[PDB]
Design a protein around this ligand. Structure first.
Ligand SMILES: Cn1cnc(Br)c1C1=CN(c2ncnc3nc[nH]c23)CCS1
Lengths: 20, 404
């Protein structure tokens, strides 16, 4: 399930920005 | 309810235009041919839209909804350009402020709670190291940031109170919003009810209308950059990526989940990427998680350009429609970037319940007023390791940050 995938992808924390 | 759009007309149509446009639009929703997808009410909507625009006295009072806003913005532009032309500089000094705790750190620099020794008031102070900023090739973004923030003035934007520099740091002192970031609550409350999301989203909508009228692109809409004040309302911070852009622009910056396609692709983009991000914000708010995620950013950008959004089952049908139109991969169809601009979002079925006047005036009942613990409370805020701020005996990068 998506929620289980969201806990999987290490992106549930504060997302830093990209300066590229 | 915009009569001019219901009749598919522009605010400057003639008296025959409204009569024929009424007859062109009454037949396209006639109760005898297109009396099918419940459009008998679109037909009544057209019927009431003629009765007001046909009457030159009814029309005149209706034209005072737009004209009031057109004027409100005109004065806001003028107030912006005076401050844009003469940006405040060295309006305080470090040793006026008692450094309390850290309030946050990261890709920028460090934001600490401080206290003005004299006025005994409470501020957030963002400390940026000149050498690290030139390291991260972020000199032009940092200079921008202070310039756009000291010149803007809106209920839902944080207010820069002071700015100044010493030998190796750039200091920025803004109003202290104590309720914490929307990110920390959105991840504790798990998600937001659709009316709750509608509350915050409408403030973002009015704030992007203000900023875009100033020709500003914000470029970092994300729940980590929105704060909740004591009235439950929204205060936006981090203007690190904001640019004044009359045409296109090209820097790929932002936060991967929230980037519009055209930022990721090498084609230029416009303000319209702020409406894309708003679609991400409403989605993450109403579901608990962002529409496009993945462990590697390039996989996020694969989803973002796919033009495929799966919606959750508890997503209302009106929200699903608004999101399909904010997360349009073709910026020539994206809501906010069409003929009627922001009015397409404002007069949308998901936003039929909301009072844009009353949301501006901070009158609405904020569905969540955070926990208040007096003047200097940092309870709504994670804790951080404190560093001490060293100040070199040599000025660093004096040439690069002259304008600061
Ligand atoms: C994430 N982020 C990027 N740039 C900045 Br500044 C920030 C943050 C904002 N925080 C703030 N807290 C309270 N009142 C504030 N007034 C302005 N900012 C305030 C704390 C977390 S860091």
């Amino acid at each position: 399930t998506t929620y289980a995938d969201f806990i999987a992808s290490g992106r549930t924390g504060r997302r830093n920005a990209i300066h590229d | 309810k915009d009569y001019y759009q219901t009749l598919g007309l522009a605010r400057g149509a003639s008296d025959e235009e409204i009569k024929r446009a009424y007859r062109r639009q009454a037949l396209r929703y006639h109760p005898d041919k297109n009396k099918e997808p419940g459009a008998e009410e679109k037909f009544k909507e057209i019927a009431e839209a003629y009765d007001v625009l046909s009457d030159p006295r009814k029309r005149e009072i209706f034209d005072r909804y737009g004209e009031e806003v057109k004027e409100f913005l005109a004065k806001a532009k003028e107030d912006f350009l005076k401050k844009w032309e003469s940006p405040a500089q060295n309006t305080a000094h470090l040793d006026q402020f008692e450094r309390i705790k850290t309030l946050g750190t990261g890709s920028f620099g460090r934001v600490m709670l401080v206290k003005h020794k004299e006025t005994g008031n409470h501020y957030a102070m963002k400390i940026l190291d000149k050498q690290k900023v030139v390291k991260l090739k972020q000199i032009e973004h940092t200079l921008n940031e202070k310039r756009i923030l000291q010149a803007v003035n809106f209920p839902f934007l944080v207010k820069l109170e002071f700015s100044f520099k010493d030998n190796s740091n750039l200091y920025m002192v803004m109003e202290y919003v104590p309720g914490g970031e929307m990110f920390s609550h959105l991840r504790r409350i798990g998600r937001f009810s659709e009316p709750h999301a509608r509350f915050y989203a409408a403030q973002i909508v009015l704030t992007f209308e203000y900023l875009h009228s100033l020709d500003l692109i914000y470029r970092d809409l994300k729940p980590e950059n929105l704060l909740i004040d004591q009235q439950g309302y929204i205060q936006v911070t981090d203007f690190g990526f904001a640019k004044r852009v009359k045409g296109r622009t090209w820097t790929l910056c932002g936060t991967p989940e929230y980037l519009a396609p055209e930022i990721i692709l090498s084609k230029g983009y416009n303000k319209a990427v702020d409406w894309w991000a708003l679609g991400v914000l409403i989605y993450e708010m109403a579901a608990g998680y962002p529409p496009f995620f993945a462990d590697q950013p390039i996989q996020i950008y694969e989803k973002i350009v796919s033009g495929k959004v799966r919606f959750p089952s508890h997503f209302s049908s009106d929200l699903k429609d608004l999101l399909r139109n904010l997360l349009q991969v073709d910026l020539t169809k994206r809501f906010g970037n069409l003929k009627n601009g922001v009015n397409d979002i404002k007069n949308h079925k998901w936003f039929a319940t909301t009072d844009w006047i009353a949301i501006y005036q901070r009158k609405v009942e904020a569905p969540f007023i955070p926990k208040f613990k007096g003047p200097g409370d940092t309870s709504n805020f994670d804790d951080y390791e404190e560093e001490e701020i060293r100040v070199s005996i040599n000025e660093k990068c004096g040439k690069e940050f002259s304008e600061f």
